[model samples]
Structures are given as C-alpha cells and as structure tokens.
Target: GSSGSSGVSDMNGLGFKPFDLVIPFAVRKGEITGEVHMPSGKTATPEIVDNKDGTVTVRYAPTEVGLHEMHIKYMGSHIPESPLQFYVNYPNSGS
Candidate 1:
C-alpha cells in the first residue's frame, strides 16, 4: 500500500451545520496532528484520535459563522489538500 494518507472528501465540502465536524484519514502510526481556524481568525481546538482501525479522526465543534479552515498532518507532513476549507452556515431557527 502507498504510504500516503488522505482526508475525507466531497464534491462540495465536508461538514454538517447542526452536528460536530469530523475529518478522518487513513495513515501509518505516527505523529498525527491538526488545526482549525475560524473565519474570524480565531483558533479552535480539535480533538484528534487514532482509531484502532488504522485511521485518524479529527472532531471540532465550530461555533463560528463562516468558512473554517483545517489542516491535518501525518508524521509532521500535511495530507493531500492540507488546509482544507469548509463553510459553516448559521443553524436554522427552530425548524
């Protein structure tokens, strides 16, 4: 298998406004790390986890109202398309 890791992908983006954002990737056991920045340039901490299934997961509860950027790295190097972008729309009112 190739020694490259990859994050979740989509045609549009990857996130749900109502639920916590999740980014997962398959990688070799190493230094797994990531960061998330809100549109306001505020830093948001993300919970990084190495799943027993050989995958790394990043979860964050974004409370900002705009496009948030993310960066995921394995072994000190970023995965494909690092610094990925995703939009967070305001939740619907009492729907």
Candidate 2:
C-alpha cells in the first residue's frame, strides 16, 4: 500500500507542493487522523478525505527543500508506518 506523488520541481511557487497519502484499510474502515511535517520538520494538519470506499486520502505539503516525516494515530493503534519520510529536493532556481 504505497502512496505519494511527484518529485521535487516547481510547486506553484506557493511555498509548498501538495501530495496525497492513501490510507489502506480493506474489509474495514475507521476514523483517520494524522499530521505531516513540512521540510522544516514541524507538525502540521493534513486534509483528510474519506473516499467512503474503505480508504482515506491525506493531502500534505513540504514547506522546504529537505527530508520530512509524517505520522498517524489511526484508531489510536500507533501504526509504525504512521511515521513516513519524504525528501524534498531542488536545483538552482534557474530563473
């Protein structure tokens, strides 16, 4: 059950790039709540979207050019994979 999108590139110059994490839960469903850390390494709220199809989507963004992490407390079960890592990289602005 892998989830994520895109490699580092121009992210709308809006200070962050958006990505999605699809929570896998087949044959069952539960309340999903979690937080993602931007490249700056800080806890921030992620937009959770329930597909109503036994899975949920977590939208997140990296605030800088560095590796970040995210975690979840799904049903308060402490899913080890809860804490995931993301690398945000880039080259010269080349503007």
Candidate 3:
C-alpha cells in the first residue's frame, strides 16, 4: 500500500536546503528496514525507529543533483522493483 505522502521533494527548512525524500510505511508488530541511494553515489540505511503510533519514517538526503532511488526491503520480502526515484536539480538563486 502506497501512502499518498510518501516520496521525495525539495523543501526549504529543517535547517539546510536539502533534497529531502520521505518514505512513510505502516507496519505491524514486526521490524522493517531499507536503504536509499543518493545521487552522489552514496547509500544510507536509515534507522527504523518504531514510533509506537503505527507508522515508520524513512528519510534520506540527496547529496547531488540527479536522480535518487530507495531500495526498500521489508519483513523478509524483497521488493524487486525500481527504486522510488526523484530528481534533484540546482536550487533557484532568483528567489
């Protein structure tokens, strides 16, 4: 099930102007985890913290201007799909 609020974007705030990508998940009483690949050829396995409020927050910061993807592996099932990808372009200077 895909949450409408899950995916990536360019939002200003949280301190720096980072290309913030958010993957929201709803899990049962089990553990779920995964990794995200940034445009700079870097990969990160974000901590899967149980919110106790019935949701999980997986986030990653893009380090370059290109397409980024998230390889999600949860509950012993391999999601053999293309990474949930997004594009990060140069920030606007005319703001």
| Candidate with the greatest lDDT versus the true structure | 2
- Residue pair clashes in candidate 2: none
Q: Candidate 3: count the clashes.
A: 0
Runs in model 3 deviating more than 4 A are: 1-25, 47-49, 79-82, 93-95
lDDT winner, 1 or 3? 1
lDDT of 3 by residue, 3-57 (tens): 6674555773333245433345446536556787877877876455555576655
Model 1 misplaced stretches (Cα beyond 4 Å) = 1-25, 28-30, 93-95
Residue 29, candidate 1: Cα error in Å is 5.4
Candidate RMSDs in Å, in order, are 13.1, 8.7, 10.1
Q: What would the per-residue lDDT of candidate 2 be over residues 1-95, giving only the tens digit for each residue?
A: 77756764675544645678786554134555677776664668777776766567778766677877787776766675678887765644446
How far is 45's C-alpha from truth in model 1 (Å)?
Answer: 2.6
The local distance difference test score of each candidate is: 0.67, 0.68, 0.59
Per-prediction tally of clashes: 0, 0, 0
lDDT of 1 at 76: 80
